Amino acid sequence: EKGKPLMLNPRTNKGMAFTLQERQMLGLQGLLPPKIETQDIQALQFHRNLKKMTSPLEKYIYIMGIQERNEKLFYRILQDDIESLMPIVYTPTVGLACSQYGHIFRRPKGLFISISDRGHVRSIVDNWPENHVKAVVVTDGERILGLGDLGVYGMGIPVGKLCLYTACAGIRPDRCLPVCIDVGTDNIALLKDPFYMGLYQKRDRTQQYDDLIDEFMKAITDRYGRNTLIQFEDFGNHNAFRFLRKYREKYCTFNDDIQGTAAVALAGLLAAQKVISKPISEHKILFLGAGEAALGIANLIVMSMVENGLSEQEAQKKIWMFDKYGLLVKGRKAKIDSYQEPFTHSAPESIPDTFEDAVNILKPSTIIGVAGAGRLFTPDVIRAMASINERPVIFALSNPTAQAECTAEEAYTLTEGRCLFASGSPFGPVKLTDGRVFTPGQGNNVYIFPGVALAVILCNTRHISDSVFLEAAKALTSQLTDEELAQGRLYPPLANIQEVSINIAIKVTEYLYANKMAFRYPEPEDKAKYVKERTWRSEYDSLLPDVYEWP
Amino acid sequence: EKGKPLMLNPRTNKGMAFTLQERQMLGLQGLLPPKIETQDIQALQFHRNLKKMTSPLEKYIYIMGIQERNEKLFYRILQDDIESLMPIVYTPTVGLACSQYGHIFRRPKGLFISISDRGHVRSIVDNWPENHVKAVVVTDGERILGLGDLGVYGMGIPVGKLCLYTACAGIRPDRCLPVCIDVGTDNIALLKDPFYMGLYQKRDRTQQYDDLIDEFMKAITDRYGRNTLIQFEDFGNHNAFRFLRKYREKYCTFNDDIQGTAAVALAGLLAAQKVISKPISEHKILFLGAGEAALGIANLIVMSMVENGLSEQEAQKKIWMFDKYGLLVKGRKAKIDSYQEPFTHSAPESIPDTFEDAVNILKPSTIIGVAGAGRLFTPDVIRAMASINERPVIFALSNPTAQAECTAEEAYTLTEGRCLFASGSPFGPVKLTDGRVFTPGQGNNVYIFPGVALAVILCNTRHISDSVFLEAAKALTSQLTDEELAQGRLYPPLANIQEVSINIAIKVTEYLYANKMAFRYPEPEDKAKYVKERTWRSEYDSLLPDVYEWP
Amino acid sequence: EKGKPLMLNPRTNKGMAFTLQERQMLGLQGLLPPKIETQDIQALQFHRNLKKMTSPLEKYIYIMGIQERNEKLFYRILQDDIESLMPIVYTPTVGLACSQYGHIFRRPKGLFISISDRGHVRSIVDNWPENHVKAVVVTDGERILGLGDLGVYGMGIPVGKLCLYTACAGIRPDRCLPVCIDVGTDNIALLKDPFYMGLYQKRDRTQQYDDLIDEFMKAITDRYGRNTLIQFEDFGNHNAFRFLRKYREKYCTFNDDIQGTAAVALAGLLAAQKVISKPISEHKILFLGAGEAALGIANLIVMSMVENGLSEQEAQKKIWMFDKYGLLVKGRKAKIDSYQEPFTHSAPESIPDTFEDAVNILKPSTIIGVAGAGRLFTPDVIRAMASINERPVIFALSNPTAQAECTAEEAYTLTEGRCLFASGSPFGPVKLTDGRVFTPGQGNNVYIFPGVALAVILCNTRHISDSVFLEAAKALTSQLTDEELAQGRLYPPLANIQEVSINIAIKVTEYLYANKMAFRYPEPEDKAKYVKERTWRSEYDSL
Ligand SMILES: NC(=O)c1ccc[n+]([C@@H]2O[C@H](COP(=O)([O-])OP(=O)(O)OC[C@H]3O[C@@H](n4cnc5c(N)ncnc54)[C@H](O)[C@@H]3O)[C@@H](O)[C@H]2O)c1
């Protein structure tokens, strides 16, 4: 294939980096201006132009323009300046982009499956032109973090996340399939817009909803394979969580809100445990929240303790949960689900009404907040920890920032800089009155999903075990240098997310083979060389035909 | 477009004549054996192989195999050895090929329009992939010369004739469309064959026949234009002749049996008139036959005399016709059609019963036989001419050989080598008893259809006048050299059919412009250079991309 | 995809059998005659046309004509009349067809890699349009059995063999890559030919040649994967045997003339054993030839014996070899390879000068002829075996009839119909004076290469062990029914080559999974169903 098509296909288009010989031999001569440049100077021109613009939204449009024009240039510039541009391509900007610029550019990307297509979903899946899809990321656009129900404009989130699959772990773009399921929207801003690109109905919440996600799962799987990696993104928590439970064993699926959070959470505790060298039986964890997030993080703490010499039942007894109804204790007015049982214990003689009370009586070394209620780590709660512990561990994991349990500012000032703090929220550094400055711990799911996704795909793995995320957690924290642990870092620098994501992938690859969950044989002797060699790269290929004389 | 497709398209395939650089740059390297040859040595290999085989049928299969593989090589070898291979590609072999090898190779070529497709013929025409069809040749396969009703196996005839359009006049192959109309067959050899490729019914002879040919004419014309050249080939004479009359004015159409015969016939008379210098009023023509052939040849004699100083009514009086019912004379038992009127005259006082009688009483300088009855030029008839004339002109034009009015052998022996003889039939040389050898005149429609077709297409002419064939006749005979006229040649050597066909085309081009029947403007100053420059040629083009350094 | 290309593509072209529905839908109405047919009518039409063709060479040209126009129809008619058309498409008439091919017709197919393309073999491999090649057959065409050095015209043989891969074992044609390596030719009649299609040079036998083969192996493997089955065919006996040794551990490779021959020979010997039940102790095998053919048969025989409770070197003691310098014996004047050593034994008191003398002293139960020197199984040799043995086994395997060690005629007559005889030659039935009628066994590599190939591809096997060929030999003989063994058949009928080939593929698949040589996971539970439902078929698809 030669001529114009080479230029209109972003997967092969090199633009001005088309060699003179390439332009002449492939019939491009005259279709480009008469000047050869390299990926280097192409990339340099873009970085320079991005430095002139200041709006994140404007940066999104500019860089997503390239992704449609020149695939390899897009992933060069993305990887050149990854810490700055991960927040532009993905959260928080992608959500802001979808909402505002859905109606104006109207450029279709990925696959749209509406409830109108019940019974014929296989035939919609058959229209996707790529034959070896390895990674599917799907949304119904119900809960875009910090905006809400954006309907089909949700498509932007799977696209953005897949960009990071490629940028961070070098997963092949052609092997990725962003999907948007349209069951309606509850947002009258969209239902009353004559220019809305989605179905004009309230979200279908009937059995037809559950049957369509079922049909989609079957359909993707029947074309691409049983081992096809599937993530649900910005679904309603109730849907996302019950779907993880329904499909986790039948399909190759994992969920960032539960399992990525658990890996990122544990990674941070493990980092905290390297500076504070506090012994295993000196440990007691108290959760604000007892939902799927708490259960997921808790499960992974239990499993970590069991690998370090404790017993499942010993590890469990070091973990307490406090939900809406208060502390979770054997025999109480409020419900206790059978997944919560393992962390529901015999009451201590004092029973608390507030979380503050619960801290004072239990005296935990670590509080983890996953309630999504708001500032429930109140100064009295933060103050009480500083009192009970030399170095208290305070994780305010609830997102977004409004829902977070406490700020970095109020966490560090009220413990006079002695707490080991992490959040999902982006808090800036905080300056105490003695002069010294604290940069808080920022837990980010991008630490986990790229490396995990790459290992599962490269191994042809069909089931993602809890131990994957355990192994992910250890792999992340094992990359913190002794110099970095002394400066109070709980998480590697995002600038190194590539090296980080690949080492996690090598270590999960090692785990999946060692435990007979890989189907890619023969098994490699060296798992490092196996992955470092199957990563997609942004360097331009030669498209030059091989001309040579005959001796 | 590059790679395998270049090789599977016979219009671009060069086979072993693909340059090393072409093979490397276009992605053919390894798809061909590792040896470069030229058209020269390709052509040489074929000629050498054809010399080892002796059956015309075997020569047909071998050479038609190339036409499907390598278009330009096919037209090189065809033109290299044109006198030998015109009879293989076309009549008489093509008819013999169709019959025998229709059922075995079963390779579809050209467009099939069946009576099953009444009302939807435009949509069948729309399936032909070439957009600028200039020349259409169509059969219903009813009367293959010297075989009969071959049904859809008739397709071979239009294909073969189009081969000669290209070989003889350099008309573009891509601009040619062979067509086969299937209305059934009356041949039970085909209707009882389970492997027959055509419709299983007797030929439809109802109004639906006339309506389908109408719909086909409209359809071809509505896609390709009003100026699109159309010939009917091996239709039943009644159909071929009444269709010429119905469409001749509405459409750009001409018929070889009537108009090609008239041009070839007149060309021969004009040649005879250069050696015998017998004056215009010393001339009297007697026809055996008074049908469309006689009328067509007669019309063109009248028009030739009128250009030389006679009057339409004077010229007519020099022409007599003798059909089944005898001599055509004002007031006789038998019918006289209004087209026959002009050559129906007042009776001479003796009235003949036999053609022999008619010769003796009228004493014509020329007898032309177009009756299709058989040996009606009996020795007494041939003898009577030798008696009445120093050099009698005897044209036995009825085809095939069985239907011919007399042989060359019996024509030359019974006039003791004094007759100027021509036939449509291929008679070998004839040796008289005084030693000397006569090569007879062979009239061949290939003298006329290539040159005429090229002029009409190159001029965007919409109507083919009688004067075209007049001009064709003069153009043919004007090419006989004075040396050739002394040896008794009535027709140029077939070995030079290319030069001959192109000069005819130049001279018809001159006529069509001079008489405002051309639509291609601006009109060229020099009509020779206009045609010599628009001829398709068999030389291979370069497909090499233009690689060059930048100064 | 649409219209004319759909007809010009032999993979898709159904010809007259394109349904009205398809024609309406795919823009074919008008491009085809009115008539609509079924594959049954096309095949029947074709079988009739072929029967009035007189020459086996005229037949080749007709059927290969269909192969270039309608691939489905080509494999239908081939499978329909598989026994008669097998020797048309392949051995022997493919060799004769090659001899006078590339002159009159000279259509190109497969992949041509020149010694001129040195260092650029990857370009050429990348020019092959198919993306999922699983089966490569390669030749340099130095040793076409019967004709010899046919240079670049040897391409016809890989093409011939891949046709049998598909016809016999239902290996997908679009996953087959015939390859001809052009390194020059020593054929003088062919170098002087101006219309020859190869390099006008003598065969490059330098290091450049060995490097080219290394580059080919690496190129095929880089594009299509390390799994890719690579089969060498009609290579020089010198190169084929040494390239097998070199590559068979590194890549997924086998050689038909060594490992295929070995497997078919053993299968015959094993069939002979069910008939006569000679106590394994009494077995004594004497080869005419000590070539890599003999070494391949010998290796598989000891593996059979070891598997039936003999120790390795105790089995080797039962096998004697005799070449151009007489019996292979310890401290002999002539030269012995390190692969010939295990079948080189201490000298018996009297050292045989002649093969007859070798038979009388050693008094063997079986004689295997693989010397390609002609009629060395002399009447006196055949009478000796008849006298020493109740049921003597005589295998005359030198392939071209004229250089077979003996005839069925000679074997059955001079043995009073007591001998179990196989050859590689197409000998007819033999009628003795006592009125009994003997049908000699025809050993044919087609019993093995199809089923083995399918199994290795389907199991994503990377190394093909000696045991695969031992298991294939056993799989072949087990196809023989009690009636067939009673009638004294040594091979199953060729008419059933498909069933035979697919049963062999199933047994080899079971062995490969059982011995951790299959890398296709998940492991199937029903191997017979796994293989049967993965075979490509001649049945037209819907478009
Ligand atoms: N590059 C292509 O255009 C292409 C397309 C189809 C097949 N192939 C060939 O087929 C052969 C078979 O593949 P294999 O099983 O050896 O692959 P593999 O064993 O190298 O990889 C194991 C699995 O991971 C996938 N994979 C590998 N690298 C990846 C990446 N960067 N992103 C996402 N997924 C990735 C594969 O599809 C496979 O499912 C390969 O040798 C390849 O050359 C190539």
Ligand SMILES: NC(=O)c1ccc[n+]([C@@H]2O[C@H](COP(=O)([O-])OP(=O)(O)OC[C@H]3O[C@@H](n4cnc5c(N)ncnc54)[C@H](O)[C@@H]3O)[C@@H](O)[C@H]2O)c1
């Ligand atoms: N903005 C968003 O898009 C969004 C929405 C929902 C959840 N989330 C995040 O995802 C996670 C999933 O939450 P979930 O589905 O388990 O919610 P849930 O209500 O099912 O469970 C959350 C837990 O917090 C507890 N809780 C609620 N209010 C409380 C209070 N005032 N005091 C103490 N405990 C209280 C609940 O009892 C429960 O145990 C949350 O941690 C949240 O950070 C984000």
Ligand SMILES: NC(=O)c1ccc[n+]([C@@H]2O[C@H](COP(=O)([O-])OP(=O)(O)OC[C@H]3O[C@@H](n4cnc5c(N)ncnc54)[C@H](O)[C@@H]3O)[C@@H](O)[C@H]2O)c1
């Ligand atoms: N060669 C191609 O692929 C192609 C296709 C379409 C259009 N064109 C271009 O469109 C322009 C317009 O054409 P034009 O009106 O000047 O043509 P023209 O005036 O040279 O020819 C007059 C007519 O005769 C036809 N013609 C010319 N040479 C012919 C041949 N060898 N056989 C049969 N028919 C022949 C033309 O189609 C036209 O109808 C041309 O300059 C040409 O380059 C080229």
Ligand SMILES: NC(=O)c1ccc[n+]([C@@H]2O[C@H](COP(=O)([O-])OP(=O)(O)OC[C@H]3O[C@@H](n4cnc5c(N)ncnc54)[C@H](O)[C@@H]3O)[C@@H](O)[C@H]2O)c1
């Ligand atoms: N074999 C074939 O495929 C075939 C078939 C028909 C015609 N042709 C040729 O095409 C031409 C067209 O013929 P047509 O359609 O005008 O036929 P027609 O019958 O319409 O006219 C032929 C003329 O010959 C005359 N004729 C017939 N028998 C005669 C006899 N015994 N004596 C004197 N005159 C006699 C007729 O009266 C008539 O004037 C013929 O000249 C013939 O050579 C060939």
Ligand SMILES: NC(=O)c1ccc[n+]([C@@H]2O[C@H](COP(=O)([O-])OP(=O)(O)OC[C@H]3O[C@@H](n4cnc5c(N)ncnc54)[C@H](O)[C@@H]3O)[C@@H](O)[C@H]2O)c1
């Ligand atoms: N189970 C069935 O009924 C059935 C039948 C036909 C195809 N399939 C296909 O098999 C797929 C499974 O994936 P896979 O292709 O990796 O496993 P597979 O079992 O189809 O592959 C086995 C190996 O042999 C190859 N192969 C299979 N059939 C072949 C043939 N006839 N000729 C040559 N090579 C052949 C394959 O490329 C692969 O390397 C399914 O997605 C399905 O589409 C399944």
Ligand SMILES: NC(=O)c1ccc[n+]([C@@H]2O[C@H](COP(=O)([O-])OP(=O)(O)OC[C@H]3O[C@@H](n4cnc5c(N)ncnc54)[C@H](O)[C@@H]3O)[C@@H](O)[C@H]2O)c1
């Ligand atoms: N069984 C089958 O279906 C099958 C298949 C393919 C090939 N073959 C045959 O395998 C044979 C291999 O032999 P090759 O010709 O390639 O030579 P080779 O070098 O492979 O082996 C021939 C052996 O015979 C010996 N030899 C030569 N002349 C001799 C003589 N007069 N007496 C005793 N020994 C002699 C040689 O020294 C050598 O040891 C071929 O003849 C070929 O026809 C058989």
